[PDB]
Amino acid sequence: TRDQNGTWEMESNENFEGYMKALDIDFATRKIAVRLTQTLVIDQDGDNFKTKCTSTFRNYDVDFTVGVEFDEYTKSLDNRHVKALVTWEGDVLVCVQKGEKENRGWKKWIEGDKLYLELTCGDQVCRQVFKKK
Numbered sequence: 001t002r003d004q005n006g007t008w009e010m011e012s013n014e015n016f017e018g019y020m021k022a023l024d025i026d027f028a029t030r031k032i033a034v035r036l037t038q039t040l041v042i043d044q045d046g047d048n049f050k051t052k053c054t055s056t057f058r059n060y061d062v063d064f065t066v067g068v069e070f071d072e073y074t075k076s077l078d079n080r081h082v083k084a085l086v087t088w089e090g091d092v093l094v095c096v097q098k099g100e101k102e103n104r105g106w107k108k109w110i111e112g113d114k115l116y117l118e119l120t121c122g123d124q125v126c127r128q129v130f131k132k133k
């Protein structure tokens with residue numbers, strides 16, 4: 001399914017530290033981020049996504065339309081300008097963030113009752129799994 005709608009509660013979060021370090025997120029921020037439970041709320045209407053990440057610390061939204069390139073300034077993350085593009089490869093939603101970091105972006109897909117999110121930057125891969133609330 002391409003339907004990724006839902007309130008998704010983080011079940012596991014593998015190598016978030018390595019991914020954040022590849023992005024040059026500061027030590028103290030990584031230390032806090034790595035311990036927090038994330039909730040990811042996805043509102044998906046056709047090609048339009050409104051994505052909201054929440055934790056007890058930082059909360060972060062990003063909206064995009066599938067197949068429409070968009071500039072991002074990754075404020076409150078690594079503070080870089082990237083050109084972002086989110087497209088479908090089969091039932092995998094693929095984001096590429098073109099810019100300074102190589103292999104930067106993510107892949108997101110549904111398997112059964114779970115949402116999988118693989119974040120990449122440089123040689124690092126972070127694997128997150130969420131379950132619907």
Ligand SMILES: *C/C=C(C)/C=C/C=C(C)/C=C/C1=C(C)CCCC1(C)C
Pocket residue numbers: 020025033038051053058059060062076077108117
């Ligand atoms: C569809 C899935 C999306 C848009 C995933 C977005 C992921 C984030 C906004 C992640 C944010 C963070 C980090 C990369 C590290 C610092 C802590 C967070 C949660 C602000």
